């Protein structure tokens, strides 16, 4: 499957694509404002994620640091990124279907639209000003709005036992972005697409 990753933000982001134990395609790239990066993701990939990283420095070997979404200091991510990260999540070719979502379970850094470019399903978006409205206790100094599990490390926020309810903090994310996951047991906002669909991920879609 093809994913076209587009930075419509006025600022540079460093896109990342991983399935947690391996890079997808090259794993990461700088995207200046307006730039597009097309990657190929192998059919059957389960548990892939795409995210943006902000305020990065990398040396000529591809090592450095980002203030949001850092994946172990690498430009080309093999692992998932440090919160806060708005996440585009997908599993492809699962018994003939693709499944996609946006998640705020690991916080929010950059607004995002995640849409198919082929027929048969709808896209999802989270584009509200979550960082500007972020509760004081969740604000990340490096930028972004952390989830409550990252900040407080309780079984209720992290859903450690598989039982948890919505919280004041999850409701904050859900009010601003109803079509993204706000906690682990949120009513699913997953979209089912035909197997082998193609997609576009757009950062700052309303910019």
Swiss-Prot record:
Classification via PROSITE patterns: THAUMATIN_1, THAUMATIN_2
One Pfam entry name: Thaumatin
Gene Ontology cellular component terms for the protein in this record: cytoplasmic vesicle
Entry keyword Signal: yes
Disulfide bond entries: 9-204, 56-66, 71-77, 121-193, 126-177, 134-145, 149-158, 159-164
Family (UniProt): Belongs to the thaumatin family.
Name assigned to this protein: Thaumatin I
Species, as recorded: Thaumatococcus daniellii (Katemfe)
Higher taxonomy: Eukaryota, Viridiplantae, Streptophyta, Embryophyta, Tracheophyta
């Amino acid at each position: 499957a093809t994913f076209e990753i587009v930075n419509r933000c006025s600022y540079t982001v460093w896109a990342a694509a991983s399935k947690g134990d391996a890079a997808l395609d090259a794993g990461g790239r700088q995207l200046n404002s307006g730039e597009s990066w097309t990657i190929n993701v192998e059919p059957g990939t389960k548990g892939g994620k795409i995210w943006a990283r902000t305020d990065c420095y990398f040396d000529d070997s591809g090592s450095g640091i980002c203030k949001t979404g850092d994946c172990g200091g690498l430009l080309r991510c093999k692992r998932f990124g440090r919160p806060p990260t708005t996440l585009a999540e997908f599993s492809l070719n699962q018994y003939g279907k693709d499944y996609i979502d946006i998640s705020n379970i690991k916080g929010f850094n950059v607004p995002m639209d995640f849409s198919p470019t082929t027929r048969g399903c709808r896209g999802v978006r989270c584009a509200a000003d979550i960082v500007g409205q972020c509760p004081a206790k969740l604000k990340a100094p490096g930028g972004g709005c952390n989830d409550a599990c990252t900040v407080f490390q309780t079984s209720e926020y992290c859903c450690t036992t598989g039982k948890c309810g919505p919280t004041e903090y999850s409701r904050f994310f859900k009010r601003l972005c109803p079509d993204a996951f706000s906690y682990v047991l949120d009513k699913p906002t997953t979209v089912t697409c035909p197997g082998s669909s193609n997609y576009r991920v757009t950062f700052c879609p309303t910019a």
